[model samples]
Target: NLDIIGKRIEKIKQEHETSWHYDQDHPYKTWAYHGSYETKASSMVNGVVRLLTKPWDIIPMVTQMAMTKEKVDTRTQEPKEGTKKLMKITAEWLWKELGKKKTPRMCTREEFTRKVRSNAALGAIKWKSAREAVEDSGFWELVDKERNLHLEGKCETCVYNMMAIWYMWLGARFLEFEALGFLNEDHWFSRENSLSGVEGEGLHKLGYILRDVSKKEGGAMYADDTAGWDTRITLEDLKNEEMVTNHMEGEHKKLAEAIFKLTYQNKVVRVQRPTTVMDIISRRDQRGSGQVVTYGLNTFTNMEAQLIRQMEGEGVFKSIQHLTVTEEIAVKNWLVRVGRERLSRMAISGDDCVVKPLDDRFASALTALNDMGKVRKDIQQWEPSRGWNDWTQVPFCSHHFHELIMKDGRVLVVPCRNQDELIGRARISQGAGWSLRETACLGKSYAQMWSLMYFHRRDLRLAANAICSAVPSHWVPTSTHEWMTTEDMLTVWNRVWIQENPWMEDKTPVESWEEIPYLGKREDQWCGSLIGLTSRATWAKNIQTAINQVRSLIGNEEYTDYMPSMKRFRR
Candidate 1:
């Protein structure tokens, strides 16, 4: 019966376009033939005729039965041969009925067979390994130990706390992002220098400035009011030295500060939301004194403490007094909802600065979480015959560094992080302090280098064209004389012109044209080398032109006697 089912599935897979998917081509591809098969099979197996298949080969089928409230001891439940026979009879009856109907939407026999085959294969791989791991003491022990540590409040106990800590850290770090040139130092973006010393009144000062600007510039009295300041001034005009020298007279400092404060406040407001445990865990004393308060792992400031007390007075946060794992999960969910609300609010257009915050520590942790999660999941699909340690690090294009290290010396480098995560991490690390420091993992710096190179290439192409055009038509060799476009000139500059120059006599010329080392590969080295080479070439050409003019004055016969040929010296 299973053999027949497998063949039918194969036939359907060959026929259908909607069911088209290939798994072996890409490990990261989720929508595959096998996935479709399992999805279809599981629905039918665990649907109306679920109980009939007693000796369940599939784990989900077993779970389906376990969920149902029956008189049998579900804990020790196993499939019966009687149940299998009954299911076969039922399937046959359904098949005959299906034959009578010409329903286009209904799944064909081939589709049914395909789903069963897929699920059967999946069950054999994933379920068998999962069962083994469950039986193994080491796996469960480690999981429990990890969970207990979080329960004890050693680290960021809950997901909400973790996210909050990251946001706060990033907020502080990115305060200096623009000044450090991690962000493009264009006039449009404002720097935060004026509000550096003044802490508590920053918000109020910003609000005042916004209203003042709006009143003058004719707009709504809001924090995001630009008021023609960005267009009028450059960053240097607002510098401390310039401001002090100019008697702090200009509106540049105030404008920059106002923009910074509004941006920061907006971010904080978006993230700050009331959690279920917030009122209870962070409430103030009965005396009504708004002082500092300390909760499980977080130390709330004066304003935050006061807000919690006010919220607590409203008769909320009464449920779940103790901080359990369940409460932590709930808080995490609440924080996610907070983010969702903020996202919806910001979905519309606004003038608030929305720079991507640099947060390497946070990005690393998130990456590690995803990496570990993927490995744990993949391990459950391993063949049961192999031990936890019996795995090899197979080289693939999409490999991670921090995947599961099995007991044996083998590495299980799962493909967990995708392009989105890469770009996200890169963006977050943009203005981060850690990213400025040299590290093996060049997450943000690598991205910045590429951005710099993109602009550099355009400028360099123009420079190359100008240089090529300067060369006399007669002096330029036949190889480069016909080049019309800047790109063609650039290619010649990197290849023929750069190699033959006396400045590069000490170094061997490149044999392969495909791999040009002194081009866009490394921005710093490439730019420096090109600049020096161009200077030398220009000097040589000028000297040659001067010699030619002198020859024209003296005539070739007199010049030969005055300037002896250097050919004898070369020999």
Candidate 2:
């Protein structure tokens, strides 16, 4: 939940200049889009530019710099130095064309490699309309307008995490639902050398482990661990609070109603007031989500590079410089063939060709998934696994796999999973140095996994960033698009966040059941990058403008007196 809320805050700040701050009355609300939309949404625009222009011809053409290092080739499936130079130039051109103001040569060659791989990992997915629609849309027009487009500089996933927080907060406040607190399982019990037992361990020492302190203070007996507990208490209360004051003592109680609060000096402290959800959000910095988002990005990038390598290794690069639409078809057909071969190896031969040699745990999990028909040969060889990985060999991680060979010959990949068990295993394996074979195998697997899941993550991130960042003031289209209109963006937002109810005065529901116009067309493309990130920034700017208008209205006592009671506090 903390990570989720953190992401939303980052997403809002990156795509819309909205800051998530709280006041006493509104525990979580936004503040501003005070800056220019272009600056705020630069990264988003750049992401679309790269996303649309795949098989980046622009990258190699510009960097005529000599090769100095050896690396794996994406097209020839060979290891060579020229490939490194090509990659460098590609990265350089992209950084320049996108949002970076610095000259490509200003950075180290290694830095260029990193930036190229980052953009390439995301751009590798072959979305059918992404290239064409982006070429035909207003997005292309803005690439060199005033600023170079940059991908969302901040993690886009934070936007959805924020929504998750919003959902929790809204449910707790308006729907009369409870805000549940949980222990970090890893620290729930006392460590071997710790002074405290379970009693003084984990979150327990700070305050109550669970339970509604508010309700308990009002004389309600604890109903469950979630009900509440006080770390601070009197000696009598420790033995008799539940038995006498509440008359509900039992072993089922997580702890005695009153836990004897202990100090570092091993002395009991006096009982104090309890804590609540409001206490945490009131002061915590909403930034931890960005850290988690990086882990997610790391995982996907590792997996994507592997997938692209495998595709390249399969002798699939028929043409890099294309002439007509027919070439695109041939390239995509090759992808399907490669995908079929890879899937077949895993499903029928039990080969390590696709995912590499899994750890015993991963092998066991994959075998189980295969048994479930998720990887069965009967399925159109294109089906993804159980949408989750039991284990990952990547350095940093967290998060599914899916693929689509689109009608226009574009290949789309989507890629999930266990938590601590898998993470612990990954940490152990990553520490062990990989043999040459293991290194190659791991790289391929990571890339494959990333390719399979890139679109899934991108789509969700874009949707959440757009839906959560916009306030009422910025809900309209900022600039013109030949293909997408203002209504389209709002409709998408409504479907994701504002469904079923009228967003405006009109009776039409914001969350309309009607099919969204140009829906799937935007999928796996830069078009989504524009709307979800940059355009929403524009919308947010409008929202700020409207907020200013509302402030002006509120300042006039005469204007306020004419408003209805419910509408007076609308701002």
Each prediction's total of clashing residue pairs, residues at least 3 apart in sequence or on different chains, is 4, 36
Candidate lDDT values, in order: 0.23, 0.23
Per-residue lDDT of model 2, residues 1-571, tens digit only: 2232344344344554442223244222321211112221011112211221222213333112211201100011122332222222222322222222211111122332343333322111122533332334353343222111112211112111121112221111110100001111112112221111121222211111111112121121111010001111112212211121121223212121111111100111111112211111211211111222222222222222223333333433332332235533544554444433322212100011123211222222222122111233323333322222221111111221223343333332212332122212211223244443333233223222222222133323332222222212212221101112223433433432224222123333333211222224354343223334554455333433433343343233221111111121235
* Model 1 C-alpha lDDT per residue in residues 463-560, reported as the tens digit of each score: 22222222222221210121322233334433432343322333343333222222233432332322334543553334334335433432333222
Candidate 1, after superposition: displacement of residue 321 in Å? Answer: 23
Which regions in candidate 2 have their CA more than 4 angstroms from the true location? 1-307, 318-326, 344-571
TM-score of each: 0.17, 0.16
List candidate 1 segments past 4 Å from native: 1-325, 328-334, 337-459, 463-529, 534-571
Error of 1 at 515 (Å): 33
- Candidate 2, 349: how far from true, in Å? 21
Q: Where does the lowest 10-residue lDDT sum fall in candidate 2? A: 174-183
